[PDB]
Swiss-Prot record, chain B:
Entry's localization field: Cytoplasm; Nucleus
Function, in words: Component of the 26S proteasome, a multiprotein complex involved in the ATP-dependent degradation of ubiquitinated proteins. This complex plays a key role in the maintenance of protein homeostasis by removing misfolded or damaged proteins, which could impair cellular functions, and by removing proteins whose functions are no longer required. Therefore, the proteasome participates in numerous cellular processes, including cell cycle progression, apoptosis, or DNA damage repair.
Signal peptide feature range: none
Family: Belongs to the AAA ATPase family.
Organism: Homo sapiens (Human)
Protein name: 26S proteasome regulatory subunit 6B
Subunit structure, interactors included: Component of the 19S proteasome regulatory particle complex. The 26S proteasome consists of a 20S core particle (CP) and two 19S regulatory subunits (RP). The regulatory particle is made of a lid composed of 9 subunits, a base containing 6 ATPases including PSMC4 and few additional components. Interacts with NR1I3. Interacts with PAAF1. Interacts with TRIM5. Interacts with ZFAND1.
Source organism superkingdom: Eukaryota
From Swiss-Prot, chain C:
Natural source organism: Homo sapiens
Similarity comment: Belongs to the AAA ATPase family.
Protein location: Cytoplasm; Nucleus
Ranges that cross the membrane: none
Shown chain mapped onto the complete sequence: 18 to 51 of 406
Name this polypeptide is given: 26S proteasome regulatory subunit 8
Entry superkingdom: Eukaryota
Role of this protein: Component of the 26S proteasome, a multiprotein complex involved in the ATP-dependent degradation of ubiquitinated proteins. This complex plays a key role in the maintenance of protein homeostasis by removing misfolded or damaged proteins, which could impair cellular functions, and by removing proteins whose functions are no longer required. Therefore, the proteasome participates in numerous cellular processes, including cell cycle progression, apoptosis, or DNA damage repair.
Swiss-Prot record, chain E:
Complete-protein stretch covered: 81 to 350 of 350
Keywords: Isopeptide bond, Phosphoprotein, Proteasome, Ubl conjugation
Species: Homo sapiens
Subunit structure: Component of the 19S proteasome regulatory particle complex. The 26S proteasome consists of a 20S core particle (CP) and two 19S regulatory subunits (RP). The regulatory particle is made of a lid composed of 9 subunits including PSMD8, a base containing 6 ATPases and few additional components. Interacts with DDI2. Interacts with TASOR.
Domain annotation PCI: ranges: 82-251
GO biological process, one term: proteasome-mediated ubiquitin-dependent protein catabolic process
UniProt cross-link Glycyl lysine isopeptide (Lys-Gly) (interchain with G-Cter in SUMO2), position: K217
GO CC field: cytosol; nucleoplasm; nucleus; proteasome accessory complex; proteasome complex; proteasome regulatory particle; proteasome regulatory particle, lid subcomplex
Family: Belongs to the proteasome subunit S14 family.
Gene: PSMD8
Entry superkingdom: Eukaryota
Record has Ubl conjugation as a keyword: yes
Stated role: Component of the 26S proteasome, a multiprotein complex involved in the ATP-dependent degradation of ubiquitinated proteins. This complex plays a key role in the maintenance of protein homeostasis by removing misfolded or damaged proteins, which could impair cellular functions, and by removing proteins whose functions are no longer required. Therefore, the proteasome participates in numerous cellular processes, including cell cycle progression, apoptosis, or DNA damage repair.
Protein name, UniProt field: 26S proteasome non-ATPase regulatory subunit 8
Curated annotation (Swiss-Prot), chain F:
Residues of the full protein shown: 2 to 191 of 953
Record's function text: Component of the 26S proteasome, a multiprotein complex involved in the ATP-dependent degradation of ubiquitinated proteins. This complex plays a key role in the maintenance of protein homeostasis by removing misfolded or damaged proteins, which could impair cellular functions, and by removing proteins whose functions are no longer required. Therefore, the proteasome participates in numerous cellular processes, including cell cycle progression, apoptosis, or DNA damage repair.
Listed name of the protein: 26S proteasome non-ATPase regulatory subunit 1
TM ranges: none
Disulfide bridges in this chain: none
Quaternary context: Component of the 19S proteasome regulatory particle complex. The 26S proteasome consists of a 20S core particle (CP) and two 19S regulatory subunits (RP). The regulatory particle is made of a lid composed of 9 subunits, a base containing 6 ATPases and few additional components including PSMD1. Interacts with ADRM1. Interacts with ZFAND1.
Family, as annotated: Belongs to the proteasome subunit S1 family.
Amino acid sequence: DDEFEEFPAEDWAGLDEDEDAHVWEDNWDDDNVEDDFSNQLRAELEKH
Amino acid sequence: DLYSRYKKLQQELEFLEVQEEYIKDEQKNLKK
Amino acid sequence: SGLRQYYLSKIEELQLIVNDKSQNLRRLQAQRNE
Amino acid sequence: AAEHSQRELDTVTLEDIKEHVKQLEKAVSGKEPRFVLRALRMLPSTSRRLNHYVLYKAVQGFFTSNNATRDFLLPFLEEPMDTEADLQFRPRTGKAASTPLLPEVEAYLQLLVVIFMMNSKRYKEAQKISDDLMQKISTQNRRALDLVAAKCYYYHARVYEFLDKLDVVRSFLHARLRTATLRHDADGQATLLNLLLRNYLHYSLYDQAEKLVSKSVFPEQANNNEWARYLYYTGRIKAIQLEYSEARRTMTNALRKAPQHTAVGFKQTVHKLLIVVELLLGEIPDRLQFRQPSLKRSLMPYFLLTQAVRTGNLAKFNQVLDQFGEKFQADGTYTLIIRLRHNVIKTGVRMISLSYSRISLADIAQKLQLDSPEDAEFIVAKAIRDGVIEASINHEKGYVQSKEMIDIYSTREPQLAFHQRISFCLDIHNMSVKAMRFPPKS
Amino acid sequence: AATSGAVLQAATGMYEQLKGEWNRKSPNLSKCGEELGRLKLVLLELNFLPTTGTKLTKQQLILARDILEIGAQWSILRKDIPSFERYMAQLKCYYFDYKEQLPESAYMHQLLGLNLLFLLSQNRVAEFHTELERLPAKDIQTNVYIKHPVSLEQYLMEGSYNKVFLAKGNIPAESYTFFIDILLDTIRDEIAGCIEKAYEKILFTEATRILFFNTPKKMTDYAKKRGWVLGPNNYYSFASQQQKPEDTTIPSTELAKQVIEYARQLEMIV
Amino acid sequence: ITSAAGIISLLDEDEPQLKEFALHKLNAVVNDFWAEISESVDKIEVLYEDEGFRSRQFAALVASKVFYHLGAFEESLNYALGAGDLFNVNDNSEYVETIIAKCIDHYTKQCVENADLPEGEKKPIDQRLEGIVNKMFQRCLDDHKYKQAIGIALETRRLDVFEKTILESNDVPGMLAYSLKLCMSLMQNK
């Protein structure tokens, strides 16, 4: 082993507990804040 | 003394090369 | 004291080469004997 | 109660140390320098499990001859607290005790002592012992001694860095690197190059680091850890300069070559730099790395930065920068983030090019929330020249048309890739056959 | 020593003469040039460039720093890029490497900003950023003399060339005016290169409009300088085809050599 | 300390006193800035080429030092030869030792190549290289280690220095026996 002592491990000062820790798949698009695709389709039908 | 050691090492290296070539040829022919 | 470092450097280079060659030759000899 | 457990642990550690010196002696006797690496492998574990009794017993048992080094070393060590069950560990027997120990063994014991002194928060004596060891190494000249001197160099630089005197050791490192290069020592070359690059980067002498990298050829037969360090530092240099593509390539290689389990901090640092350089290039880093348990909390600010970059919003970007301003400075990426804060639009143009085969400049302006389409045209031209997007502009109609995708297979490129990999595999087989040993004739 | 003190006195006397020659309402230019030409040689004996920290005469260090400062400003006022580079090479050393004991001047940040702008004008963005890294963090976000080159570089990266073309008017100190012109010429050249590599058969609502040429004929000389065909008016084909290399010859000798090497490695006794 | 850029800058200024100051400072700080000097080494090359200069030897020495640091040992040897007496053969420094070894090897190879040729086509040998090798021979003789001098004499085909070393010694008969053993031992060229 060649433990890289020169580079320190990130400090655990705060070390806040996991918010949700859900383990499904993450994925980027989940971050998006959409507007209720149902409402989107209703608006699309209304505006034709 | 140092000259003798240096030249002896040179001769040893040449002999090792000769032996290496001979052994490779011997292996190739032993396959046949 | 005079031209000793030069001789020693050449001898050390030759010794390293000879050690490597001897190791390779021993491996080859083992295979040949098999 | 734990005293007996500590004593038996010390005894087993002494047995391990004796095995290590036996291995070094066997290496020297057999003219197989690579053997000493087996003993050097356990350096971290041995350092972790070292103790005062261990060090004192080891030095007493291993320095019967040439007691000058015992005189220089023992005073630093603490005398055993009225030990009464001392076994007077005597590894060297009779002729072995009388004869002067080997230079490699003396260097190894000195290295153990300096590591212990460093682990303890006592750096002055660590520096003194280190300087003595380096004088011994400079005086001596052997192969296995050079292999040990590699780690000796590493810890000497470490103690000086702790002292905050990294500048003064620069000339020492340069001199030793020159000697190693003349003597054809790959391990020493690698260790000294990595330490010198670390020295330069600490003070931000990026021009000096770049010049040294350009003029020195890293050894190919270097340990994977040294390769990882070198790749990280070269990627850092290229990223600070404007070579983002090469930086990303080199740093992906560095992270790939880093040890799988350990080196957590190195992984965090390389990951942060990779995130920033990818954002600068305009791509989007993979989200899998953002949830690994080890790299989870550290990379949260960079996660938010990537979020803002993807959903480009200067308000969110400035909020994130203002919040985690100090941590970026601490970690060494604030300047790169500042560059990203103004080259953010590159990512939007990349997404537009990826999605649309032919779009109007007015539509590009609308999508990128820019001013009149002239600014969009200038941005697109800049991107095309930079090579971010393979597209051609046409203002006689006023739209950007993406280039076609060429049939890569019909080209000779697959042949080149496969030839590279075939040569690599053949070299692997040849070296794996040469590594074989048949020992019965010994 | 008495001789050391006397020669220090001579050097400071020449420096005071230069101060009188320059800091008036209008420098003599040539007179200050001769003064600096002799003061360069004069400086040699007062340890011009300490090869080691070895804290030496603070008076010598300050005198050398000031002389090189005035020399760099003289070069900029005389319109001599080589002289400016030669003076800055040493001024940077004095500012960065001996400052551990020597105090911090009042022109340090202005001269560093001058250097950054000079690098940007010569289009050495790599060196620009390498140097920008040396300076502290707060000074790159506070000092008005260091903030002009940074803003110009950021706009150049963003591609908003219009912003800089209008921001030329604002200058922290008149010295920057010289280098702003070379920066504008270089930015015009970069726009031309971007248009050439990108685009296909000119347009961009006429080349003059996007190249920011006041008169229609002002771009003709640069069009002639570059290898542009000069087709219809404001219509220069860039030949982005690059000859469209389509000829393929099946490199055969090299492939045969590669396969023969494969066979050699497969058959030879390792 | 650091940078080492102004010293290089002060080399194109047409004043052969600032030029010499810069050359001396570069010689002082060459072991720690060889990479920086290497990019501009052509300036020192042109300085050496210029005969009008006065510190031609010093320019040659500094250029040779930077080239030796780089790895271009042939160029370093050539410039060390041109550097004249400023190369102090009797100096215990790594640069001195490595360049001395390079000159010895170069002379050995050239002499061996020349030996097996007619006198008409004998390729010329640089007199500076000859002088360096002769100085090393003299150092051997002064230190009294005659066997090393004999060895290098035989290797370089210098029968003259071989004879001189045999005669000027304390054990003439012993040296004769040693040389005869070398001849009727590993010495193959008939």
